[PDB]
Design a binder for these strands. Sequence first.
RNA 1: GGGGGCCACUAGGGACAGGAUGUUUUAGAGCUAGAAAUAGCAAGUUAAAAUAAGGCUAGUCCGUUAUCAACUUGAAAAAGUGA
DNA 2: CAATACCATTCCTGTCCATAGTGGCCCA
DNA 3: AATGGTATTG
Length: 1336
Amino acid sequence: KKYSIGLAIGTNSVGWAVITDEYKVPSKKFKVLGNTDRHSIKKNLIGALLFDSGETAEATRLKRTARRRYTRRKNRICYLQEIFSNEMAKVDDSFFHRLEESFLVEEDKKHERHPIFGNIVDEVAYHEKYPTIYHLRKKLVDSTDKADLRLIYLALAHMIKFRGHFLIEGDLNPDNSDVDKLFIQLVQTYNQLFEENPINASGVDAKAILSARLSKSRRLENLIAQLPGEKKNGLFGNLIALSLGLTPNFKSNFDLAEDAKLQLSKDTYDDDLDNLLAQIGDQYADLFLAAKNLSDAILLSDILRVNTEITKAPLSASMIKRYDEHHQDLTLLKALVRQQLPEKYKEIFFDQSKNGYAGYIDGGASQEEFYKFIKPILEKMDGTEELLVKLNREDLLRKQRTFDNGSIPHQIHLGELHAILRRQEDFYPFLKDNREKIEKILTFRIPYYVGPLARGNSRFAWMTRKSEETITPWNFEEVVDKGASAQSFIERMTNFDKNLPNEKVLPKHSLLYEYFTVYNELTKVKYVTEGMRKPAFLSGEQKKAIVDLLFKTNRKVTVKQLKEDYFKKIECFDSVEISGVEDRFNASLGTYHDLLKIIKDKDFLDNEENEDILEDIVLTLTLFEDREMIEERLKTYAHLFDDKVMKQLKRRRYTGWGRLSRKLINGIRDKQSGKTILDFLKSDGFANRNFMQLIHDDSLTFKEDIQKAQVSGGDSLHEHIANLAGSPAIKKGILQTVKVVDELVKVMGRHKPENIVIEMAREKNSRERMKRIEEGIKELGSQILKEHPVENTQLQNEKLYLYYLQNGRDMYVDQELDINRLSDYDVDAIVPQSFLKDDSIDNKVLTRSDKNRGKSDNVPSEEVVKKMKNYWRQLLNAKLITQRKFDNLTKAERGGLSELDKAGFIKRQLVETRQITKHVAQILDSRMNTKYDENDKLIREVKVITLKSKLVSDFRKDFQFYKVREINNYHHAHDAYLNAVVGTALIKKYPKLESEFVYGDKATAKYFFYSNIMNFFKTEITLAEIRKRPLIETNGETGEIVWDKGRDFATVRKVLSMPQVNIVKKTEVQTGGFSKESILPKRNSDKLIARKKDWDPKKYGGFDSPTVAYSVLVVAKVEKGKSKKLKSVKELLGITIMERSSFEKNPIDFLEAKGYKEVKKDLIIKLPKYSLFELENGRKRMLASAGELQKGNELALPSKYVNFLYLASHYEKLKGSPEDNEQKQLFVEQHKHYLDEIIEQISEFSKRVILADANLDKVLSAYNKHRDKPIREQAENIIHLFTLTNLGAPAAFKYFDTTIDRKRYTSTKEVLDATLIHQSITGLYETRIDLSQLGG
RNA sequence: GGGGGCCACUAGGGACAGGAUGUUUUAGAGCUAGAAAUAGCAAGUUAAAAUAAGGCUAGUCCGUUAUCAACUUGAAAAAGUGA
DNA sequence: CAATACCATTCCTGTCCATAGTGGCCCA
DNA sequence: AATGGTATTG
Ligand SMILES: [K+]
Ligand SMILES: [K+]
Ligand SMILES: [K+]
Ligand SMILES: [K+]
Ligand SMILES: [K+]
Ligand SMILES: [K+]
Ligand SMILES: [K+]
Ligand SMILES: [K+]
Ligand SMILES: [K+]
Ligand SMILES: [K+]
Ligand SMILES: [K+]
Ligand SMILES: [K+]
Ligand SMILES: [K+]
Ligand SMILES: [Mg+2]
Ligand SMILES: [Mg+2]
């Protein structure tokens, strides 16, 4: 008894089938367990496991980190209160108690209800004097009077609890005023450097134009307008853009070739300014210098909208400006609405439901929704011009705690905190002694390279302590080993050397590593001249000379420099042919040139004595990112360099690690020669062996030493699958697949199959699209977003996305495109889809007409390339197209598509090469084949074949075994079946293909062969004339029969027509969040759940809508009526995720607390979601919850109706042949009565199983309404009708324009008397429990 | 040789440190006319506190991923059970 | 009970590691 | 996006 298994692996399904020698599907009697009269059941060996998607760890991580943040913010406030403890006790012994209980209702408050002062008079007076916290902040910053300790606490606590960002390193407020004079001085330095061409900035109000509460680019335009001449793209224009964002290429300004750009915020700024001044002269330094100067007073102008000379609290002053303008404009708006349009006053100022001022202050209306609601009301009235200006600048009636405060750096809050401490430390000594402690509370962050401050109970932590004691912000440097922690941060994530698994890899930018890469590339270079008989390698002396002359004087070495600067200069060759490198060397000594610029001592770099030193420096610069730790670690070399060089040196940093270790590169030595790997790369006689040859050559000891160093370590199956690189979604399917194969082998008497054939399906976002387009267009300098505004959702249209990615132009022709005629344009595949089935934006292009591409059987013609290469390069530099898209677009200037390329593409269409599928194949193969032969080589009893979906897809379409995904879930199982059939047949016919399709170890010819690989199934083949194949197809050598075109197609038809298919929805305990996150207001309802143990929801609000982890069958008694008489019940109790641990720790106590008595402990049945019940007439239901059910039956629609629906709907495309198109159309029209028959099948199924009477009647009327519609559209909507019958949760669907809402099953009472069906993973093994036999 | 190193991209996974909103209860004396219903008017921008209930291992830690038919012997990990 | 309509905390900055898809040089 | 919780209407 031999058999094969077909598998179809998806993100929500694993289809499986078992086939025999004749491509038939067996059927067995399987024993049925339980307490029903049914002892067995006939099962076909085909089906599909269904499951909800596996989820990533992301959401869990975001929640975990936000938790840690709330905990540490609370601890910040706690530190502050601990500082204030005793002196506050002297002033007001219950202030902090009032703060802590501020949330409680007056009934529950232990102290007086007014938090700050504990009496209504003083509290009301406080709020009158200080309407916002920023009033109190500014007063405490500016005033000199002794202030009440409680108000001091309130100001400092507000600064510490909402402390601003940390994106800016260093200290702040160097220049806060005289921006007018700074701008005059920048204009002055420009005029000094260009005495012939000066700029007159007299009268230019640079303050108002540049500190304008508007975008930077707009201010640039205005300022350039004020200066006569001086176009925005001139030198001074880009220098104004310097304080603004882009500061684009000065190459236009200085006529230099390479691209320039600067950004005073980037830490590469000093190096880029050096790189530029080396190209143009240090005399321009004062030009950027002054620029930087003028920037300092203006960089914060967006945040500090008030002069910095009347207050030392410009931020809080700006908030008070917000408040005062809010008040003035509110008075004015109220008066206007009273006068002009008095009927709307109530809707604006009283209606929270509307988006007026009421809904904006008291309702749920946002600033944007309010601006939208009030725009027309302001335009409709008079005297609202200034208010409309403030509205379109987003500065009308602003609150102070707003979504856009995220740009406030922590240094500003710190400045105000320090100012207050300085004012009041004169009166309170404890503020003087704790000034720096409080400042530290504000300024302290745990470094990202330290992680959680755990003590052995966090699986996420790596930090090591210098001593065992509580870490505070003030003793962090002493208790936490920052260096060891920062090291472990990297070393717990980096790979070891695979060849020497106990050796760490080198920094990618190590000098040694780059010597290795350069010599490895260089040793395989060959050259030919005239007198030479044969191309020669480079000798060791030649490689040393090329490294010293070229690689050590140029960052990048081109083949041209090799030919002219070495072979002509040293070898006196006029002509030489180079192989092994094209255009320019890929490897390069970048770090060598970095350190040469920094230290300016070529002899120091070239001295081998300093090798180790340099290796450490780069190591440090790689291992650490914090400037102080880098500095401390380089301190040991402070004696070798000048302080200027030490500063420049600690400035420069590297990221990334190599893949080889130092011991591999320049450590282990060959026994005979005594040479390291690098020594052979530098010189290897006449062989010039490279790295691979070196570690594989049996005449050397490197291979032996690597073998010896290797250690094997073992993961479990689940651990192994978890550690694969793939989506957790597909990993869930992989593990399910292995469990399914295990059960299937158990079903077949523990006999292993002959073949296993596996196919694997191919595998918010609009925000990424909008980001791409914004960046690319502002990098392009285009005004397309100015002239055509767009929202992210709109970019989900392919053509509009392409339009914006193409700067609104045609990509094959130099002309504009029209947004409104997008429907008339074309979307063309760069490399045609007949070769590369790629439908992504990386291979698609928007053009006015695909006809202009040229011939349709290749990449675009050379004319197009010549015309459009520069435009495409612009788009590439804007990151609007990728390098792959650009290269494919330009392939015609590189010979176009060759015949080898087309052969390869067609092979790719058939031979799977994704790593993840290969891992699935390896897993199955290592589980199935476990014995070794006499030569100790693996015995492959089971052949694991992998196929791509296109094989079986083309099969289905060519032999009319059509699939319709919406009818039911049987297509996953059928895919599995057809995979088994096609794979086994394919390798039976052509055994030599095993190398390609089985796991384990003339271009026209392969093109033809792989295009016609599947023709042995067809009876006649039309290929560019008509050829004919026999009725029986056999193997050429063995003579064995592989395919009987008569009987075997009938076998396949019979298998696809079988109604009994084992579809199983995997039952799962629900996990995750306890409930919806919405904190709801107070309500008289027991559905509300307290947010804290003592916060009664009827007084405080809270949560509702909790998630049931799993239901539980309870057979017990419950008290009834005022008498409390015991009454026997049987019902489903939903155990929520939050209740689950309590219920499981002791089920009886939990249930008795819920109200039940005398619980029959042994009749408690755990019922996860999707638990299956059968009732009468085969009607099935699945548990959706403790109080709702899902549809549980599959509609086994016959194959003739399935194929009719496919053909009539024009599912996919029917264009194979004109005459075959005609035959399909004729069959559709001849069998048009199949529409009524299909409606009848749906109706019978619904009346037996679905039981949505009203919905079925509405659907029947809708079908009888559109009987005159074309057959195509009626079929297309009949497809939609199956949403009524599909398995799972009920859903709404549409028949033409009629909408059918979901009919829900909002009661679980009936399943309590039905038959509960427990199913194994395949559903072949069942345990059926009659629940009606359970009762009181 | 579907292994390896390098170059150029692109896409996804994982961890950590931080920012701003939002929400919820309370505080921010509402006034006047009327028995009330209600009407007319005034006012509004701020804060505290919580932000999974909570847990013990008590850390400036942990609490939403992965994994799960039933039954048996099992404390549990497990292993076994049916053409 | 049964049907029906509404509801669902959001967005952002920075540091770092690995894998794997495409094209290319050199090899096992 | 879905689909299970919830209140409202009977
Ligand atoms: K009280
Ligand atoms: K001008
Ligand atoms: K609001
Ligand atoms: K190259
Ligand atoms: K680094
Ligand atoms: K020195
Ligand atoms: K889920
Ligand atoms: K789960
Ligand atoms: K109030
Ligand atoms: K199951
Ligand atoms: K929000
Ligand atoms: K992030
Ligand atoms: K590659
Ligand atoms: Mg907490
Ligand atoms: Mg808040």
